[PDB]
């Protein structure tokens, strides 16, 4: 755990700046459009499994030059709350 | 050379040609003899795609005839 996280945090922030995954390009890049309105033609670090992420995923971009640091699976919308049970 | 913003021209309004003892400005200022007090020449207000407007004394290489009041 200890030596793996050293180099995990190297390429991680501070800000992790959520993106929206518009389309993938297959060279380890994608075009994201951020909620903050500038696009980025992002790289992909290649430990998060390059093609395991698809349009509509929410992406963690680095505080400096944007690489896909990682990928969030699940982002709770109130629109799937209606379907999903609470009782 | 590049890069440089591209904007539209609000208007050409033009402050008087600088040969006057009393500023060079259509809208006259306080104080007696001016030329480069806060008197500047020919004026263009341009409106940007950075969502503001600016009053400048514009370059004299390019005429107030080469400036329309809606020119890019």
């Amino acid at each position: 755990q200890e030596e793996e996280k050293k180099q995990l945090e190297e390429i991680r922030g501070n800000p992790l700046s959520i993106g929206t995954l518009e389309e993938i390009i297959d060279d380890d890049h994608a075009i994201v459009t951020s909620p903050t309105m500038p696009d980025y033609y992002v790289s992909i670090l290649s430990f998060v499994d390059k093609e395991l992420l698809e349009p509509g995923c929410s992406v963690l971009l680095h505080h400096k030059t944007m690489s896909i640091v990682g990928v969030l699976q699940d982002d709770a919308d109130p629109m799937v709350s209606v379907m999903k049970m609470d009782k | 050379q590049l890069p440089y913003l591209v904007a539209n021209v609000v208007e050409v309004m033009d402050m008087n040609e600088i040969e006057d003892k009393e500023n060079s400005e259509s809208t006259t200022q306080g104080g007696n003899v001016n030329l480069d007090n806060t008197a500047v020449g020919k004026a263009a207000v341009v409106k940007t795609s950075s969502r503001q407007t600016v009053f400048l004394p514009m370059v004299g290489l390019v005429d107030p005839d080469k400036l329309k009041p809606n020119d890019l």
């Binding site: 500038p38 696009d39 | 590049l2 890069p3 913003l5 591209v6 904007a7 795609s49 950075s50």
Partner: peptide, 17 residues
């Protein structure tokens, strides 16, 4: 396309040469 520079519109809306 300006024949010999281009006018782009960024996704920032801001237009540039």
């Amino acid at each position: 396309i300006i024949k010999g520079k281009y006018v782009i519109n960024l996704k920032q809306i801001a237009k540039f040469v």
